[model samples]
Target chain A: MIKVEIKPSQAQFTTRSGVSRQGKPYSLNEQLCYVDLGNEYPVLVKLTLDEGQPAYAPGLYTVHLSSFKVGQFGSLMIDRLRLVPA
Target chain B: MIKVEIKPSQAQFTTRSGVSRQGKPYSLNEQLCYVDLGNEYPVLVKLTLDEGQPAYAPGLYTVHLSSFKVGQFGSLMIDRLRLVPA
Candidate 1:
């Protein structure tokens, strides 16, 4: 189980299609969020699940910030990620 | 447990603070990423951890595309999110 800890600002979802922001085709990746931990460069995160559907269920989740690890090239190691009602 | 399902296109991370993209203040939140899955509108996800540090060390992750769910206001439900070496 990958243990990740973080405090996110906003949450979003995707489905492998072309999404646009301000008329620009954003195709770098899918499933993105903005996290804040009072650091110098705010982390830009992307996620993808291995299921047949969405996991978070399009909304906001309060992540339990603790003991999260970052790997090379921004790989995430989530551990007991808590999802509180937003 | 939150049984969420989603097929994301990308992943990213953020810490907190004023992060800029193309010389623009991206402060609606902190961590941010763009997701796609062949829908009319792609998902833009945001994440934050509750740890004293970063959960995902500034980098990218590979999300498995399958059984993903979308909720009100673009929230996501992920399931078995697998992160392969990218």
Candidate 2:
């Protein structure tokens, strides 16, 4: 499974295939909301796989995040990825 | 107040003109470090102004970060930007 965190506001998502899958590529899983995350930027948007489980059963996965506009400047920082103790 | 959270590893910073300021553009203020920020990515590097106080005195300032290598890929996400009240 894969996890991702994004800032609130307008964003774009991309798959390895380039541009939207065009045919329902992914289904919204679980999403979390953050308030007053900070300023100078937006709030935090975190994503996790298998409910953020640590153990990986050996497989492959693809992740995506919103895109950026032409001139606007911003960032999407990933904070952590923990491997739950078995 | 521009706050940024960058993944742990190597990074790059640029001023308005382009390429390192060449001569000290910014001084390290309050920097907070994170652990295991997340795999798929890196840890978090948070910078706060005035010990993270939300106040502005009407001034223009410049900020900077590490630099990025050529091949390898990474991201520097900014999740917050607040205008601390007086």
Candidate 3:
């Protein structure tokens, strides 16, 4: 998984196309990404990149995850972040 | 419930003080943030802010969220993002 530090601004999809990564077309409602943290529960982030093109707006957005009890034992970590396209 | 769209880079905390927001000291292991989507599901993002300061490094880091099945129905949206302090 591609591990990288992120802020709250980069975690949202503000465009008609639910995509966060520029140029990377991660389709929404069909694309799935995992946020894993080894011993901690893993999260599957779903997206919808259907704004005609790949671009985010950075407005009111919907965020997703796997578990609620993360970062309780240690720092937050996303293990295997892979995009499962459909 | 504050809704906002986001990319993926802002969803991670690069510093040892698992904080995504600058100037906002959301303690890790004790601080809990909610990434809600109402109908779809809610996510509780866990963090650890123990770096003595609030700032992200944007390097190899970790991320946290609530559910795995997000962005399956519609575009990505973060419902009520609240910070629960310990």
Candidate 4:
């Protein structure tokens, strides 16, 4: 099985209960990628930052990863996270 | 559930029954990342090109997307694919 990992490019977010969320990416930060679920394996999963999205304006962002897989519906595992500035 | 779709950065690979394979990267294509899954929601998934990786010679590459998702343990759905040259 191929191990996967999704992470933020910057430390401009918040993580709780294994779930990462930057409720202020567009405004506080820029147009960052937040719906990043680093490692997905065993079963395919979908990550989204669409629900209750934060406010405002950056430009664009890319979410990447380099880790392993976890459970079907649990945990927020990540390897490398980042948020490219505009 | 968020949809998940994993695709290759380049059209150099061949996909059959949803599984994609490009048997020439590290030695034939270069050190390119062979994993890029876009639009994930419902469940999480781990995309890997570790198995029977392609040969190559490229320095650094990035696999990205802006599309949708698909099923679990099945399907190779993808939207908007690109291979950034090093």
Candidate 5:
């Protein structure tokens, strides 16, 4: 398993995809995250769950970067996550 | 107090302000959140506390928007929070 550290911002929320009444892509979860990966530059990323809403929190994470997707506007969209007992 | 909903992304982390060894602003907490805010357009915001670390989580929030600051990139940096049990 390829592992990389992902730290969420000071807040957390869930996201799903759907089309609005106008048929354009509509999202109700409006959360913007900019993170500093051990530096001054902050990169944008997205997190999603294919199944259920697990208690996903921010602090530190060991995740599979490749398992995610290309979120809109060039952000790393995350779909799969695994948490190991620390 | 202007009340607005602040929904964090599906992750959370703590951020502290300190100058890096390179003599620039540095933040250790790296968390990203994108919420729809009852629409498709997402607004970026930041969360911070002047004191202790509280369990900042992802959900719906009615906050005092004016009490925050102009976090770089125009994200709202929250320094004060009052939780009302619903």
Candidate 6:
């Protein structure tokens, strides 16, 4: 895992369409953080938060590969996301 | 699961980079089949293969969801691949 810092303004909390089943909609709020990889390309990460989220702010954090998913019209959402500093 | 047919020549079997550890490059042959999700968009699926890939000739098969991955810079591989018809 690489260490990086997330600008407080670089993160956003938004609702996302989840798996809809049995005539029901499974939607939830997803957190996104933009990182330049400090290098590689830029990444829009979808953080995995269950109960709720912490008020994000600028600080050192870690990145992990959780998995992958379909991007929006082709926009890649890193699949996984930033982790609390290790 | 969706019923799919593979065209011997149309289906390409190639090697893909895998999770390498301990200074080893873990790469393996991947069977990629392109499928159009009609009006939505298209999908390039990475299918899981058998011991050595059986004779891949144009034939009927069943498409199963294993997973998906980042294909290109932002391209999604739909990681889970097509499967043989059950």
Give the number of the best model, judged by lDDT.
Answer: 6
Where model 4 places Cα greater than 4 Å from the true spot, the runs are: A1-82, B1-54, B66-84
Q: A1-86, model 6: which lDDT tens digit per residue? A: 34445567756556667565667766565555544434465455445454465635667665443433335543223354436664
lDDT of 4 by residue, A1-86 (tens): 11223333432334323323854444222222333223243223333233354422334333333221233433223322232232
Q: Once superposed on the true structure, which residue ranges of model 5 sit more than 4 Å away at CA?
A: A1-86, B1-10, B17-40, B65-86
Per-model TM-score versus the true fold: 0.23, 0.21, 0.22, 0.22, 0.26, 0.35
User: Model 5 over residues A16-75: C-alpha lDDT tens digits?
Assistant: 679988889855443334433334555554444334444445544443323433345433
TM-score of chain B of 4: 0.20
Query: Total backbone clashes of model 4?
Result: 49
Candidate 4 to truth, TM? 0.22
Best by TM-score: 6
Off by over 4 Å in 1: A1-29, A40-42, A55-60, A64-84, B1-86
Determine which window of 10 residues in candidate 4 chain A has minimal summed lDDT: A75-84
Better of 2 and 3 by TM-score: 3
* Candidate 4, B1-86: lDDT as tens digits: 11233224432433333323755433222222333223253233333233365523324443343222343523222322232333
**Higher TM-score: candidate 3 or 6?**
6
lDDT tens readout by residue for model 3, B9-50 = 544454334556566655442334444334465445544444
TM-scores of chain A across the candidates, in order, are 0.33, 0.20, 0.23, 0.19, 0.38, 0.48
lDDT, candidate 5, at A76: 31
DockQ of each: 0.03, 0.10, 0.08, 0.03, 0.02, 0.04
Candidate 1 vs candidate 2: which has greater lDDT? 1
Native contacts retained per candidate? 0.00, 0.13, 0.15, 0.00, 0.00, 0.00
Docking level for model 1:
incorrect
Worst 10 residues of 1 chain A by lDDT: A1-10
- How far residue A80's Cα lies from its native spot in candidate 3, in Å, is 2.5
Considering lDDT, where higher is better, how would the candidates rank from best to worst?
A: 6, 5, 1, 3, 4, 2
